[PDB]
Amino acid sequence: VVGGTEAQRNSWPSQISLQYRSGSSWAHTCGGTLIRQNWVMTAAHCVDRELTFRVVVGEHNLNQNNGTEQYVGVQKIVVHPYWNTDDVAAGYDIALLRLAQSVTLNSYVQLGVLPRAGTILANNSPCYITGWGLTRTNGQLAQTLQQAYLPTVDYAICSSSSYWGSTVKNSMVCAGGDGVRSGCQGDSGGPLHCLVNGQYAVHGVTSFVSRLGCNVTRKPTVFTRVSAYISWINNVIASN
């Protein structure tokens, strides 16, 4: 997260760290949202590699014992059937991970609330991005969870030529684009939490940024729109 502030440790309890085994240690690679006690929602591009993944819930500082973490293996990865690794701009950047054990819920570990199917937010809706991603373009990962305020940019504006043009589709949400705040590498897969009717719901799964850099004026961070996939997500969980 570029331009973020450190999040309080109990503010976004659905946030997960998705990590892969690297030699004798584990490295953070993407974020995710806990949506059932044994299911996590993340981006399909985060699980493309043939790597061993684990999920960390209740995490705050990646490099220190917080005393609240739970570590769980991934048993099954279900990527959207239309996802195509060579065309991220085509959309469908979403995946569901079935965990090996159910986690225990508490103040630091809660389920993320999903919007109703088809819901679109009005332009400039108040949302926050969270993650341990790079804090500057070509910089380093954050040790502690960061958050940044990133108001939505509706489809009509976001798909205009000075923004993202035809690269953005109606199955995506744009947020930010002020040149100061944005998601960056390592935030992918994580949530975009938006306030609707007094409750924070997860409307986006972080997907991509510009080739010019993370925080670029008029190139808002682009997320998969969760509300476009509610039928698919429910269909997966019900049969697995």
Partner: peptide
């Protein structure tokens, strides 16, 4: 585009 850059996946992040």
């Amino acid at each position: 585009v850059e996946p992040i």
